[model samples]
Target: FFDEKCNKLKGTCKNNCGKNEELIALCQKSLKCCRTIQPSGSIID
Candidate 1:
């Protein structure tokens, strides 16, 4: 279920982006595709 459109940019599939993150894409059925820039939960692992 790779619906997270933030793939190429390596965005994270989470329920929310949190305080230092942004919601780039809506991942999975109940997950949010978070794109972290200069934040704790970064884009790439």
Candidate 2:
């Protein structure tokens, strides 16, 4: 799912996109997504 979204985001970034912001937002979102599904349930310090 995220791969698909990332691919789409990359496509968008290739054409008139705010590359840094978009990639940062995607990274943040991906982090959130990863956190939600981790088995260890680690907390950030």
Candidate 3:
């Protein structure tokens, strides 16, 4: 829960955000909050 703002930022939460994306934060449920790379993108990040 480091970047709790993930939710507010409309980030992407997934088991893994590979490639251009980076792990900005995490969830207790074992998910990665990834900040978008390029442009465009969702929830519970």
What's the lDDT for candidate 3? Answer: 0.71
* Candidate 3 residue spans exceeding 4 A from truth: 39-45
lDDT of each: 0.68, 0.32, 0.71
lDDT of 1 at 40: 54
Worst 10 residues of 2 by lDDT: 29-38
Residues 1-45, model 2: lDDT tens digits: 663565554422222233222222233333311221223444222
For all predictions, the C-alpha RMSD in Å is: 5.5, 11.4, 6.3
The estimated TM-scores of all candidates read 0.58, 0.22, 0.57
The CA lDDT at 39 in model 2 is: 34
lDDT of 1 by residue, 1-45 (tens): 344347776777789777566877766578887766774554444
Candidate ordering by TM-score (highest first): 1, 3, 2
**Global fold similarity of model 3 (TM-score):** 0.57
- Residue-level error in angstroms, candidate 3, position 24: 0.4
